[PDB]
């Protein structure tokens, strides 16, 4: 029961309230790829040791001559970490007099405002974490502003690998490119163990997935099948799996021993420019599809995990030299009952210890 329009003396009804929460994506965060590695200091080091092998050259017996092998190579690297701080304040003049949306004549309290502010802060930090994880998956950790914090390829002295699927050409060998991507991980892992290249994640965008599932070779291959998989993929829901941040079921496609998942995650920064999670810095031709292939968790084993995220303490008066945390929230009151201050801190870095395994994928031809 609130004042009607046009007249302050007659009444109308206020049925309810509709809200438009922004879309948020958390696929990479929910994947569980980046194991948590709490940290005490502000920087962490790492030792890199490797050796090489060669073939013996035949040497004659009577002239007693031999061969030798080069010694090992040991290096060391260091990592800085990003600090995120976000401040929010509550004041009496945004509570006094202001009316609670969706209600006729009841007033906003401090509790609802505080709850909504904290929820927005936590959501912002979650989407920032997801964007950082995706950037680390790309192999280069670029901040939303654009500043470089850790270039994994130069740090480990490796070169990025990209594969051109050439989905436009009807005669393209999809099997050949899939096999190349599959064998690249096995060849460049160099962990000393036995690698299974079929255990990888291939995350592509909308255009790449559309061009892949509509290729004449793939469709003609799956149409001439009498298996339930082909029936589902051709005439059926292409949305198995999922539980994405927005959609309940992500698009995925089985062609070889690998799967292609379509990820639509995108965010905006303060400047207004959008940040598509599945993208290549530089490419924007609109008609080319891009993707990112990274090793599965169960490929190198749990003993050799390559996806870790660090956390170090905030610079507060009593948190020094302690284990890091996902997020710190602090309550500070303004003097003279003038309001309440909020601060949120998070000091993290996602990184990959084997950046060579992060393989890029494109839909155009080289």
């Amino acid at each position: 029961l609130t004042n009607s329009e046009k007249s302050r003396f007659f009444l109308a009804d206020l049925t309810g309230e509709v809200q438009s929460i922004p879309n948020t994506y958390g696929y990479i965060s929910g994947l569980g790829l980046f194991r948590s590695a709490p940290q005490t200091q502000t920087t962490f080091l790492m030792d890199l040791t490797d050796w090489d092998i060669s073939l013996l050259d035949a040497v004659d017996r009577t002239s007693r001559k031999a061969e030798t092998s080069a010694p090992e190579r040991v290096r060391q690297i260091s990592f800085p970490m990003m600090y995120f701080k976000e401040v929010e304040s509550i004041t009496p003049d945004e509570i006094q007099g202001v009316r609670q949306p969706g209600t006729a004549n009841e007033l906003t309290t401090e509790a609802v405002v505080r709850a909504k502010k904290l929820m927005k802060i936590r959501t912002k930090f979650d989407i920032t974490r997801e964007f950082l994880f995706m950037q680390a998956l790309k192999g280069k950790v670029i901040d939303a502003n654009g500043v470089l914090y850790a270039d994994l390829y130069k740090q480990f002295d490796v070169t990025k690998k990209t594969i051109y699927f050439d989905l436009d050409n009807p005669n393209s060998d999809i099997d050949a490119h899939i096999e190349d991507l599959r064998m690249h991980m096995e060849d460049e892992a160099k962990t000393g163990t036995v690698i299974n290249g079929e255990e990888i994640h291939i995350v592509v965008d909308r255009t790449f997935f559309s061009k892949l599932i509509k290729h004449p070779k793939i469709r003609d291959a799956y149409l001439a099948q009498q298996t339930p998989l082909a029936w589902q993929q051709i005439t059926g829901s292409l949305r198995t799996g999922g539980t994405d941040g927005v959609q309940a079921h992500m698009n995925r496609f089985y062609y070889g021993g690998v799967v292609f998942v379509q990820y639509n995650g995108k965010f905006k920064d303060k400047r207004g420019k959008t940040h598509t999670l599945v993208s290549i810095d530089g490419v924007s031709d609109t008609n080319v599809g891009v993707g990112h292939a990274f090793p599965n968790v169960a490929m190198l084993g749990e003993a050799n995990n390559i996806f870790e995220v660090a956390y170090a303490p905030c610079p507060k008066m009593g948190y020094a030299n302690t284990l890091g945390q996902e997020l710190y929230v602090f309550e500070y009151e303004k003097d003279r009952d003038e309001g309440i201050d909020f601060e949120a801190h998070s000091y993290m870095l996602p990184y990959c210890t084997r950046p060579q395994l992060l393989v890029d994928v494109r839909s155009d031809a080289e």
Binding site: L55, E67, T68, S69, A70, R75, K154
Partner: protein, 123 residues
Amino acid sequence: AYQGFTKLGEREPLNDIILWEEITPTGHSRKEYAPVASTEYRVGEVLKADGSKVAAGQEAQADSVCIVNFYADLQLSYHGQLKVVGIYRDAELKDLLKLESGVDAAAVKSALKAKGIDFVPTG
């Protein structure tokens, strides 16, 4: 860093290049030098008679091969020794050689081979 990568350095070469040497009570193939000026020695660098590294055009006067890691700032070796020791007599080292800029290896190897230092192939 502002450049994107921080490389704290590479481990200095280990004293493992020696495969065989004339083992004698006082040491036969090893001689000690006076560390000249502010000079950073490492394992496998070819030295002259005075103690400085061989430079381009000075290959014929190759006197020995350094087998210690010296530090100019500390004026001490990596084992806390006051002098720098090289290999100048009958011995057999590996191909690992820290040559200077613009100095050919073949002239250095032949000069060392004249004194009885042999180099083995390394894979």
